[PDB]
């Protein structure tokens, strides 16, 4: 492995635990729902809402072998966009009707974070929690 630590859980880790481990006194889980799609893009996963000092932030999570395929469909679906697209990982950031959206994939994980406020701060939190885990 080039990285023993990265911004996603280990490949064996539970999708549910990947959500629940993010909760702190400053990031309070308020909702969890299974999903089949993100808009018009098929994506069998879950979405969680965290209440933060900035307001609610939404985290969409997918675990599986099609993370890249889905992320590419998402990236192809806003006025402005920034995209890093590598063979084995990707990240984009965009804005849609006031909401910041950041979406990334690596290995068997795809995450989307969206919200009116506090998205970058929440993403950094997610990075920090996952980075501590051993791949």
SS3 call for 91: strand
Q: Are 93 and 100 in contact (CB under 8 A)?
A: yes
| Helix, strand counts (H, E) of the chain | 3, 7
Solved how? X-ray
How far is Cα 85 from Cα 92, in angstroms, rounded to an integer?
Answer: 8
> 45 burial class (0-12, 13-18, 19+ CB within 10 angstroms)?
buried
Residues 6+ away with beta carbon under 8 Å from 70? 41, 42, 43, 62, 105, 110
Q: Which residues pair with 58 in a beta bridge?
A: 49, 114
Q: Are 74 and 103 in contact (CB under 8 A)?
A: yes
Query: Interior CA angle at 74 toward 127 and 50, to 5°?
Result: 40
What are the structure tokens assigned to 129, written together? Answer: 């929690």
How far is Cα 12 from Cα 1, in angstroms, rounded to an integer?
Answer: 15
Q: List, in sequence order, every beta strand (DSSP E) within the chain.
A: 28-38, 41-52, 55-63, 81-85, 89-96, 99-106, 109-115
Query: Interior CA angle at 33 toward 32 and 35, to 5°?
Result: 145
> Could you tell me if residue 11 is left (phi over 0), alpha (psi between -120 and 50 degrees) or otherwise beta?
alpha
What single DSSP character describes residue 2?
A: -
Closest C-alpha among 55, 57, 33, 29 to residue 44: 33
- From the CB of residue 104, how many other CB atoms can be counted at a distance below 10 Å? 22
Options 3.40.50.10860, 3.40.190.10, 3.40.1000.20, 3.40.367.20; CATH for 1-135 is: 3.40.1000.20
Q: Are 75 and 112 in contact (CB under 8 A)?
A: no
What are the structure tokens assigned to 21, written together? Answer: 């481990």
Domain boundaries, the chain: 1-135
Resolution in A: 1.8
């Amino acid at each position: 492995k080039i990285h023993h630590h990265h911004h996603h859980p280990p490949e064996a880790y539970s999708l549910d635990t990947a959500i629940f481990v993010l909760e702190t006194r400053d990031y309070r889980l308020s909702d969890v729902k299974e999903i089949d799609s993100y808009g018009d893009v098929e994506m069998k996963g879950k979405v969680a809402v965290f209440e933060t000092e900035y307001g609610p932030v939404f985290l969409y999570v997918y675990k599986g072998e099609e993370a890249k395929k889905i992320w590419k469909k998402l990236n192809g679906r806003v006025s402005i966009r920034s995209v890093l697209d590598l063979p084995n990982m990707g990240k984009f950031s965009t804005v849609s009707n006031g909401k910041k959206i950041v979406a990334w994939w690596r290995k068997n994980w795809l995450f989307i974070v969206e919200g009116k406020n506090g998205v970058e701060e929440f993403v950094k939190h997610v990075y920090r929690v996952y980075e501590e885990m051993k791949q």
